[PDB]
Ligand SMILES: Nc1nc2c(ncn2[C@@H]2O[C@H](COP(=O)(O)OP(=O)(O)O)[C@@H](O)[C@H]2O)c(=O)[nH]1
């Protein structure tokens with residue numbers, strides 16, 4: 228039984244809490260909208276193997292978190308979330324990745340660039356410049372919507388595979 232530590236990073240309001248809940252939710256609770264950072268557990272199967280995912284939904288750069296740096300020491304991979312309708316959230320990705328590289332003293336850190344809210348037709352961040360940013364960091368790019376559940380499982384499963392590929 229292999230565990231995986233995942234950290235969800237991004238500006239405030241990009242949907243990090245909403246993406247993490249849609250993966251985790253067993254739908255016992257109708258709707259649950261967290262406000263405080265927290266960690267959550269989910270069993271998944273990737274390429275034959277069972278996998279326990281610890282998912283930490285961090286607060287944005289706006290909010291203070293005492294454990295912020297420790298979360299990144301613990302994190303094995305990272306979901307970098309912006310919203311495709313907030314251009315500053317896209318520009319903030321450079322800071323969060325730079326912050327990960329500082330705490331982890333490394334560039335080859337398993338990450339996945341994630342452009343949330345793919346349901347809003349007010350698309351300001353083109354898919355092509357998002358893929359370009361992902362190309363420059365050497366990491367996959369996945370489009371998701373925590374509102375329509377699309378891509379949600381694909382993002383997290385991609386991150387776990389990055390961890391696997393990095394491990395060798
Ligand atoms: N249309 C749309 N709205 C979303 C989506 N994800 C989150 N939201 C809304 O964005 C607001 C803030 O999302 P939240 O999960 O708290 O983001 P966080 O600040 O990173 O934790 C909430 O009102 C959500 O309903 C999405 O995928 N599509």
Ligand SMILES: [Mg+2]
Nearest residue numbers: 244261262263
């Ligand atoms: Mg939140």
